[PDB]
Amino acid sequence: DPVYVDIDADSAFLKALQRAYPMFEVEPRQVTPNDAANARAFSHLAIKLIEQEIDPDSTILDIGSAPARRMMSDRKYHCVCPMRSAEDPERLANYARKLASAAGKVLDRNISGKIGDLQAVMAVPDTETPTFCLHTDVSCRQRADVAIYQDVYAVHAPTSLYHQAIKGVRLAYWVGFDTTPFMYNAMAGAYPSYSTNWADEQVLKAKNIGLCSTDLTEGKLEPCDRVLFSVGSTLYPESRKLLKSWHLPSVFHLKGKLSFTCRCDTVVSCEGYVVKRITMSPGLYGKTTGYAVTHHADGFLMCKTTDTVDGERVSFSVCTYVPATICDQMTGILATEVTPEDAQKLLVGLNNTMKNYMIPVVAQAFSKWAKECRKDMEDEKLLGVRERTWAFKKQKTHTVYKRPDTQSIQKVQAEFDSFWSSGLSIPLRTRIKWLLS
Amino acid sequence: DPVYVDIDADSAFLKALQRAYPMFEVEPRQVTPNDAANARAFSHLAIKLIEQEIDPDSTILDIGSAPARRMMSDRKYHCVCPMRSAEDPERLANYARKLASAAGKVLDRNISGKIGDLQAVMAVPDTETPTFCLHTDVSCRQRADVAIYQDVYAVHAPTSLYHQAIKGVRLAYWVGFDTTPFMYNAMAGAYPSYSTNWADEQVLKAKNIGLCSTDLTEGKLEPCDRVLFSVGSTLYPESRKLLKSWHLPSVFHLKGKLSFTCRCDTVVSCEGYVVKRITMSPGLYGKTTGYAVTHHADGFLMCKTTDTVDGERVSFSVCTYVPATICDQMTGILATEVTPEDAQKLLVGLNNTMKNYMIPVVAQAFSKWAKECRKDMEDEKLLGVRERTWAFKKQKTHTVYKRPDTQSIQKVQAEFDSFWSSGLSIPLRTRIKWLLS
Amino acid sequence: DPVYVDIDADSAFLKALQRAYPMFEVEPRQVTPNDAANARAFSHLAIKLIEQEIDPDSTILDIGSAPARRMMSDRKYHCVCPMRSAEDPERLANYARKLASAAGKVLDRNISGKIGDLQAVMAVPDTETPTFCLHTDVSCRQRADVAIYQDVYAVHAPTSLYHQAIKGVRLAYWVGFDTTPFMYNAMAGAYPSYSTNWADEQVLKAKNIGLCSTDLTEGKLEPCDRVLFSVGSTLYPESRKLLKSWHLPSVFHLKGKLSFTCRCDTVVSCEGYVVKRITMSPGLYGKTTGYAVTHHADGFLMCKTTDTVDGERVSFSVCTYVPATICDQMTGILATEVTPEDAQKLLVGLNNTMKNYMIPVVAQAFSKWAKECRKDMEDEKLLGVRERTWAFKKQKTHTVYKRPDTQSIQKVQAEFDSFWSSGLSIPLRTRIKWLLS
Numbered sequence A, B, C: 001d002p003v004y005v006d007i008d009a010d011s012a013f014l015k016a017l018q019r020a021y022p023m024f025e026v027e028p029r030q031v032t033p034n035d036a037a038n039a040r041a042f043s044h045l046a047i048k049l050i051e052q053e054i055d056p057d058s059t060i061l062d063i064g065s066a067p068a069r070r071m072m073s074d075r076k077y078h079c080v081c082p083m084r085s086a087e088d089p090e091r092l093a094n095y096a097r098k099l100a101s102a103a104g105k106v107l108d109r110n111i112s113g114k115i116g117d118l119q120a121v122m123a124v125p126d127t128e129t130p131t132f133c134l135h136t137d138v139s140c141r142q143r144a145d146v147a148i149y150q151d152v153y154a155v156h157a158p159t160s161l162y163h164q165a166i167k168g169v170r171l172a173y174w175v176g177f178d179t180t181p182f183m184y185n186a187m188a189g190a191y192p193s194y195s196t197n198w199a200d201e202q203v204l205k206a207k208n209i210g211l212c213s214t215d216l217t218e219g220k221l222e223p224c225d226r227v228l229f230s231v232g233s234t235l236y237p238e239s240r241k242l243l244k245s246w247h248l249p250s251v252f253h254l255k256g257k258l259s260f261t262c263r264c265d266t267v268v269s270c271e272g273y274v275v276k277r278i279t280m281s282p283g284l285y286g287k288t289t290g291y292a293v294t295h296h297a298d299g300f301l302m303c304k305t306t307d308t309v310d311g312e313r314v315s316f317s318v319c320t321y322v323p324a325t326i327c328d329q330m331t332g333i334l335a336t337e338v339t340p341e342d343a344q345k346l347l348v349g350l351n352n353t354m355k356n357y358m359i360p361v362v363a364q365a366f367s368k369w370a371k372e373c374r375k376d377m378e379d380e381k382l383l384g385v386r387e388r389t390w391a392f393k394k395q396k397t398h399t400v401y402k403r404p405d406t407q408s409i410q411k412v413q414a415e416f417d418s419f420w421s422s423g424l425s426i427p428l429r430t431r432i433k434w435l436l437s
């Protein structure tokens, strides 16, 4: 009945987890000093919930999978496992090792069948087995009804979903980080509850952001495609286009040789991690608007800041998340004009609910926001009238602040109409064959 | 005997629910983290009360229905289900799935008959069955005596009611959001107890309203038909004309080939959600005035505010709801002239009874209202006399404030005299047929 | 023995009810969220008391009745039910439905006879039965000895009473709102204990009265016949002439072909609701004066106020009721001159005994009254002398204040000498016939 997570029994994250999964009983049982524990716990609980949702005797496609995670499960999984990243051979070797280790002690699972399928794929690499294949998402021939994406950021979402749908899949899930900070086009940012920082490749030599490094000395800039992610002490390169492609609107159409109508919604949300549910049906129905909405339970901040990159002083924008209680407790102070130092002292007085290294920039954002409010109250126009004497002036905005219980809305695309080699090596196949034997 | 609702046991909304349904026993039993829970609970209790009102052995038309909600009920429902929105195929598939799942475990309900009717409609799409059809409201041929509208905002009320009445219906119900803010012709607004914000399509790029999104930068306007609604994180487009059409007067006439006299009244009201009861009788009787009345148990505010839309500074009107206790506790302060900052500090001191993101604009409205009162006391006219020396000046009004235990009144129309394709697809029909089997 | 009322067990109104009916035991038993509960409770208790007064085996005429209210009573009622308003067909249908529902379960009442009379009237509409007819008050042929008017404001009182008296009626009762504010000729007013506001048709676009509605903008008047009443959220149009006609003097004469001497007195009075008892006797006796008296247990206020109607600033008079304890506690302050703001703060300090939305205007009235007193003390005349040098000046009066334990007196008329179609439809008759069967 209860679910066990590998975090310390005194952490404050546990509270939040119990709020996000009220249908479970969460128990802390710590065994490793892992520095990316919270993300692992969230993914574990998400998979538990998804399994509890769908009915048995349904085959499930696992896109970009690590097979060792699905061994002790009683459901039917077909793992789609190409070898495109540098961490895949180790995952395959670990899977083979774990399969060999427990060969007669566990009998309620299809262990012998799994070994047979692995050996068959090793012998001939272009064959589909009930539990394994070596193709990509757009070339696997297996037919199923459910698909799952877990921490997959390297595919174009509409094309992948269309190729999943033309094979009879009616339900899909997606687990990963929230894509909202990338629709605002920021330079760098943090997910502080998960110990995650990310930065654009051009500001890696800054001084006072989460992920940077610089030296000692005596004495156009716009976002690009390539981004670096750091979860704990693990590094991942990412692309802005593919991250943006997963920010889907509420309803959309897929129009090719066959046609489908699909809808997407968010079912779990905890401080930056989300779970998305997508349903697809045959035929065209209704009409689309092209808007995507995000609900904010915490505060979301984006602001402009000044730093030195490689010794040269520049300015760019950063984003972060703020707990709701602090935002509620700062309501009265922001009615006047306040300097950044006083705001910093007040925030330190209220605070650990939030990480300290993020405080100095937050205090700089609030101070600006309040000021921009006062000016609005002092230059009051007339109702239903615009002045455009033919040019009109644009005011300056240095801060965007989405308070708890508000919503963001953005215009995206909603109509889509436009949409092999083994890669393995002889020594790796021989090693796997010997490991199984 | 008791009724269970899917909200947390510590929420303050529960209190209000117990005040709106004093004939029930409300128990919290939370199973999902749904962010639109309060609206669902209100709708659930409303349906329970309506069922407890009318007598059994009466057939009930369900206009624009989701059939899966009526499966486990012992009453007789005829669901009118066209496919005009993009969320309908999924609802139909869910209905078929739920019907198939419980086929022999539940025997007190007409499960087998429901399956037979669904299969018959799938085989031929232009046939009426006792529990299902695929026509619209003005083309269904079934005869009944009660009709129900649940969260239906996309029909013209007099025409629909006339077509319901010429078929022998004598009673109707309507559940939805209050239409008063749209008779005042506001730009944007909030229902804060239900986590709902709405805005006109022209101000979606503002900065400091509930539903908007903007960017960072260095540097005639009147309401239109199209409106956007956001309930939790679900988005709905709406039209002002159809929303306004449901704000009916106390008595009205329907004059066509046959004639009817009808009357409408509000029976449940909780912070923005209402239940309306309409009765229709044959023949013409009495005479009409054309007025509609709203009773305010909380405070209702409408005020003018200044913002920047896409960088350009403009002014427009917003509306909101205020709890009665705060309004009662602000009576003494508003006897003098008060600045917005002092009002903001006082409101924060009194406050969480109300959401904080709504406070800064409320504090701006009160401050103006009080000032407009003082001027009235300082320019006193004579009894029963008007000055029109031929033009007379009009004063300026920046705030409308309806205090608890007051009433709004508005002039509307009260005399009405002026009032098909399957749309389904072969793959969807085949999928439903296979799902049932 | 005890009487049950549909109000909440914590309301302060209950106290007052127990003071008005000391011969009963009042118990709260709340079942509906009705917003006009207090008026319903008062009417219920009034009917109980009237029934307890008169002796049995007397037939009672019920003028302008709703028959469903008299079904479960053991007395003999003859209901006079024309169809002149738009709410009558629904009342008739409800009566028929309730009659059909309990046809064999209740046997101590003349249920079968009631059904027979209803069917007979349906068959032929111009016949009198022991319990039903379709005529007006001046055309019913039934003979009785008691008549009852319950919330009837649409008849001319002397003519109706004469036509009741020429048929052998010797006693009559009247239940309704107090008519005193209409003999003072006010523009608008409130009954705050019953959640009732009323206004003249010409000031429906004001801003700061109980019943009004206005908009946002940048920039002879005398009372007329038509008035609007709002009880909770129910709207009723009324005429000033017919309301005034029910303010009868202590003794009066009816002189026609036959002659009668009648007298009227008030027997129950609670914060605006009254019960009146009228007795009529054959022949002419005594002589009349033509005065009507009202006793005040609470404070009654009438004052001049300034507002904006449709944007134009005007002045008119409003009236209200004030609890006796507040009036007693303001005696010492009103010995000097006091500003409206100080009076508002003092009233808020004393106050919830009274509704807050009525406070700002009350504070404005008191402040004026006190001032008008000081001037009187500073311009002192001689005993038994008038100055009329031939014109005399008239002073200005802006407030009328009737304190508790005082009496109003007014001159009215006391000598009176000057005093049909079915209207039903075939479909309604058929519907009633089918409902009974």
Ligand SMILES: Nc1ncnc2c1ncn2[C@@H]1O[C@H](CSCC[C@H](N)C(=O)O)[C@@H](O)[C@H]1O
Binding pocket: A063, A064, A065, A066, A080, A082, A083, A084, A085, A088, A135, A136, A137, A138, A150, A151, A152, A153, A154, A155
């Ligand atoms: N086009 C494609 N189709 C299917 N899988 C792909 C793919 N491109 C990359 N991948 C795989 O996606 C994986 C992302 S790493 C994610 C691994 C796994 N989901 C986990 O939870 O750890 C990589 O191993 C890569 O091999």
Ligand SMILES: Nc1ncnc2c1ncn2[C@@H]1O[C@H](CSCC[C@H](N)C(=O)O)[C@@H](O)[C@H]1O
Binding pocket: B063, B064, B065, B066, B080, B082, B083, B084, B085, B088, B135, B136, B137, B138, B150, B151, B152, B153, B154, B155
């Ligand atoms: N003219 C019409 N007649 C009948 N139904 C209509 C209609 N126009 C739209 N509808 C239906 O009304 C529905 C509104 S969505 C409401 C669904 C349901 N009442 C619920 O509680 O969830 C849509 O599914 C749409 O199919």
Ligand SMILES: Nc1ncnc2c1ncn2[C@@H]1O[C@H](CSCC[C@H](N)C(=O)O)[C@@H](O)[C@H]1O
Binding pocket: C063, C064, C065, C066, C080, C082, C083, C084, C085, C088, C135, C136, C137, C138, C150, C151, C152, C153, C154, C155
């Ligand atoms: N001239 C007349 N003679 C008798 N009844 C009349 C009348 N004019 C109007 N009425 C009736 O008086 C009623 C007033 S509404 C009052 C209904 C009832 N007394 C109650 O307590 O609810 C209307 O239904 C109308 O039909």
Ligand SMILES: [Mg+2]
Binding pocket: A234
């Ligand atoms: Mg690791």
Ligand SMILES: [Mg+2]
Binding pocket: B234
């Ligand atoms: Mg939902």
Ligand SMILES: [Mg+2]
Binding pocket: C234
């Ligand atoms: Mg009513």
Ligand SMILES: [Zn+2]
Binding pocket: A078, A079, A080, A128, A132, A133, A134, A135, A140, A141, A142
């Ligand atoms: Zn495969």
Ligand SMILES: [Zn+2]
Binding pocket: B078, B079, B080, B128, B132, B133, B134, B135, B140, B141, B142
């Ligand atoms: Zn039908």
Ligand SMILES: [Zn+2]
Binding pocket: C078, C079, C080, C128, C132, C133, C134, C135, C140, C141, C142
């Ligand atoms: Zn009669």
